[PDB]
Every structure is written in structure tokens, then in C-alpha cells.
């Protein structure tokens, strides 16, 4: 993995701090923070108000989140600056104590990108619990050469992208901190996910890779959003957050937990909102940035994707 000093941020600290919020606390003085990293086309609240904000509260954490603008549609590398800055802030604000990170969709790619390229946070993240992460991107976007004009981070989550290439070649498809990846073969956004194998976009070597169907059977169906919100997802995430190993444990879940509906402990209103989690993403995409090329890799990542084409041209060594 990359070593040495962290790369410089492209955004000022004040901007990065403005993207971080905690429930009922300031990041500078917070007990048992958990950092929630949202999905493409959403803010922290839109990703987590109906699920892991209340669920982590009941598990004894202070939920905190980042909301990189606009709605996680900008450069994934910029979104990661928000996360790295937040880990640094919440580590100090909790008394110099490691904290867990819990993510949905792109948020897991962001987390692993930060752990790969910003060495200072490896000692500050206790564990990573990623729901439907797309470390390999998704092939459902189609080939890069045919992609319609799309948001910066949508380019970067397209399989074949310079970003996913650089993550892989820098060592980022192996876990860096104890990581659990919960995902679904029936994901309608991120594929391939069907093999229960290293082919899957959510898979990390040495991670606790939990394809729901491997536990629940081939008839179990949860979609991209259900991967975050389901009762099964809650049991796995609870296992990961409590485990002394930092990863979910098979002994903590079984067939009786294979309920695809929103987590039981959510209120009826939260269950409704959780089922409708994905809709704001489309609206943000319609109003959001669009371009005909993948954003350039920042200098710290360019050496890992020589030959790939971004907006400024082919990456050279």
C-alpha cells in the first residue's frame, strides 16, 4: 500500500468541516462516534435518516455523517477528502479513540480509497462495515466508451474506470482495516455480485464478505437499497460493530434473520422512508453535474492507472 505522508487536500479545512455533522453533538466533542458515508446522489441524511442513524443510536453510538456536495456526484477523490478530514476530526473529538465507519454504495469505495491513499487514518478507523460497496464499480453502466454524459462519480464507478483501476493497482482490493462487506446477488445497480467469489464488486481479500444469498438461499432478494436497510443487513452490521475482531461473525446470524424488509426496530415511518431510499438519487442526477469523460486522477493516484483515459487525456507514467 501507499506509505508516507498524506496527500494534500484540494479543499480548505473549513469546507471539509462544513460537510460533517453529528447527531446532537459537535465533532470536536463526541462520544462513540460512528462515521456514515452516503451513496451516490444523496446526502448523509438522505442515505441514513431512515436506517443507520436511528439504528446506530440504539446500539450506543453517536451517528455522524458527511454530505459532500452536490449529493456525492462530484469527483470521488474529493468526496474522500471529506471522509479523511472527518475521521481525523472524530478521532480527536472522541478523545483520540478509533471509530467505526459504516457506508452505503459509493461510500464504501470512498472509505477504501481513503484508507489506501491517506495512511494517517489507518490507525484511526477501528473497522469498516460496507453495505453494497462497489470497489470494482459496476458493469451495469455499460462500457466507458458508450457511457452517456454522466456525473463525475458515475464515471468513476463505471467498471474499467481509471479510479477503480488505480484502487486495485495500489492494493485496495484487499482489506486495510477489519472490513465486512454485505451485498446481494440481486443488486440492480452494482454488478457483478452473483458469484459469491472474488469476482464480486463488493469483495475484498481477507474481508468478511457476506453475499446475502450465500446465507439466506437463492430465493432471498434485496436490492441495492435493501442491502443497507434490511433486517438481515441490520443483524450483520450489528455483528460487525460488536465483534472483537472488527468483522461480522457467522455465529451471530442465521436463517431466521433472513428478512428482506426494513429492519424491525425501525418505526413504521422509517420503514416506509427506507423502502423509498433510492428516489432522491435520481432527482440529484437530473439536476446535477454531467460530463463526457472521467475526472482526472489526482497526482497521488495517477501512477496506478497509466494508460487509462481521463478528461485531460491518457495517463502517462
Residues engaged in binding its own copies (CB under 8 A): 2, 4, 7, 136, 168-169, 171, 173-174, 197-199, 205-206, 299-300, 302-304, 306-307, 314, 316-317
* Cβ neighbours for 124, distance < 8 A, ≥ 6 positions apart: 87, 88, 91, 98, 99
Q: Which does 9 bind (CB under 5 to 8 A by kind): its own copies, Na ion, none?
A: none
Catalytic, out of 75, 187, 200, 223 = 187
Instruction: Tell me the DSSP string of 4-51.
Output: SSPPPPSS-HHHHHHTEEETTBBTTB-SSEEEEE--TT--HHHHHTTT
| Closest of 178, 72, 196, 197 to residue 126, by C-alpha | 178
Residue tagged active-site, from 50, 105, 201, 239: 105
Q: What angle do CA 226, 228, 229 make, to 5 degrees?
A: 65
In the numeric block, which cell numbers belong to residue 281? 438519487
Q: Is position 6 annotated as part of the catalytic site?
A: no
105 given a catalytic annotation? yes
Quote the least distance from Cβ 40 to Na ion, whole Å: 9
Rounded distance, CA 29 to CA 14, Å?
17
- Residue 142 or 171: the one with the smaller Cβ distance to its own copies is 171
Question: In whole angstroms, what separates CA 25 from the centre of its chain?
Answer: 23
Identify what 299 binds: its own copies, Na ion, none; CB under 5 to 8 Å per kind.
Answer: its own copies
Strands 208-211 and 179-183: parallel
Residue 282's binding partner among its own copies, Na ion, none (Cβ under 5 to 8 angstroms by kind) is none
Helix (H) or strand (E) holding 228: helix 226-229
For the CB of residue 141, give the shortest distance to its own copies in the complex, in Å: 18
Name which of 217 and 307 has its Cβ closer to its own copies.
Answer: 307
Quick check: is 296 catalytic?
A: no
Shorter beta-carbon distance to its own copies: residue 249 or 309: 309
Smallest separation, CB 117 to its own copies (Å): 9
Which one is catalytic: 94, 153, 201, 224? 224
Asked if 94 contacts 86 with a C-beta cutoff of 8 angstroms, the reply is no
Provide the pairing of β-strand 125-131 with 99-104: parallel
Residues interacting with Na ion, by CB under 5 A?
146-147, 150-151, 285, 288, 290
Of 8 and 251, nearer to its own copies (C-beta) is: 8
CB of 136 to its own copies, least distance (A): 7
Closest to its own copies by CB, 176 or 284: 176
**Residue 147: which of its own copies, Na ion, none does it interact with, CB under 5 to 8 A by kind?**
Na ion
Which residues are known catalytic residues?
105, 187, 224
Amino acid at each position: 500500500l501507499p506509505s508516507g505522508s498524506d496527500p494534500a487536500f484540494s479543499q480548505p479545512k473549513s469546507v471539509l468541516d462544513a460537510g460533517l455533522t453529528c447527531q446532537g453533538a459537535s465533532p470536536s466533542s463526541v462520544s462513540k462516534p460512528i462515521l456514515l458515508v452516503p451513496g451516490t446522489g444523496t446526502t448523509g441524511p438522505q442515505s441514513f435518516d431512515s436506517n443507520w442513524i436511528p439504528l446506530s443510536t440504539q446500539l450506543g453510538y453517536t451517528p455522524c455523517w458527511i454530505s459532500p456536495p452536490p449529493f456525492m456526484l462530484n469527483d470521488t477523490q474529493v468526496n474522500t477528502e471529506y471522509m479523511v478530514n472527518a475521521i481525523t476530526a472524530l478521532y480527536a473529538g472522541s478523545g483520540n479513540n478509533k471509530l467505526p465507519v459504516l457506508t452505503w454504495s459509493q461510500g464504501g469505495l470512498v472509505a477504501q480509497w481513503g484508507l489506501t491513499f491517506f495512511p494517517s487514518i489507518r490507525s484511526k478507523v477501528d473497522r469498516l462495515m460496507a453495505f453494497a460497496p462497489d470497489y470494482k464499480g459496476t458493469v451495469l453502466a455499460g462500457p466507458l466508451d458508450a457511457l452517456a454524459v454522466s456525473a463525475p462519480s458515475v464515471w468513476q464507478q463505471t467498471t474499467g474506470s481509471a479510479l477503480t483501476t488505480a484502487l486495485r493497482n495500489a492494493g485496495g482490493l484487499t482489506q486495510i482495516v477489519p472490513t465486512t462487506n454485505l451485498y446481494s446477488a440481486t443488486d440492480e445497480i452494482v454488478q457483478p455480485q452473483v458469484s459469491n467469489s472474488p469476482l464480486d464488486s463488493s469483495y475484498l481479500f481477507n474481508g468478511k464478505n457476506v453475499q446475502a444469498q450465500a446465507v439466506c438461499g437463492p430465493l432471498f432478494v434485496i436490492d441495492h437499497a435493501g442491502s443497507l436497510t434490511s433486517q438481515f443487513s441490520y443483524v450483520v452490521g450489528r455483528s460487525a460493530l460488536r465483534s472483537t475482531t472488527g468483522q461480522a461473525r457467522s455465529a451471530d446470524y442465521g436463517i431466521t434473520d433472513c428478512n428482506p424488509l426494513p429492519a424491525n426496530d425501525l418505526t413504521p415511518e422509517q420503514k416506509v422512508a427506507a423502502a423509498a431510499l433510492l428516489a432522491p438519487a435520481a432527482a440529484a442526477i437530473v439536476a446535477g453535474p454531467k460530463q463526457n469523460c472521467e475526472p482526472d486522477l489526482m497526482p497521488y493516484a495517477r501512477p496506478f492507472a497509466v494508460g487509462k483515459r481521463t478528461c485531460s487525456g491518457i495517463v502517462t507514467p
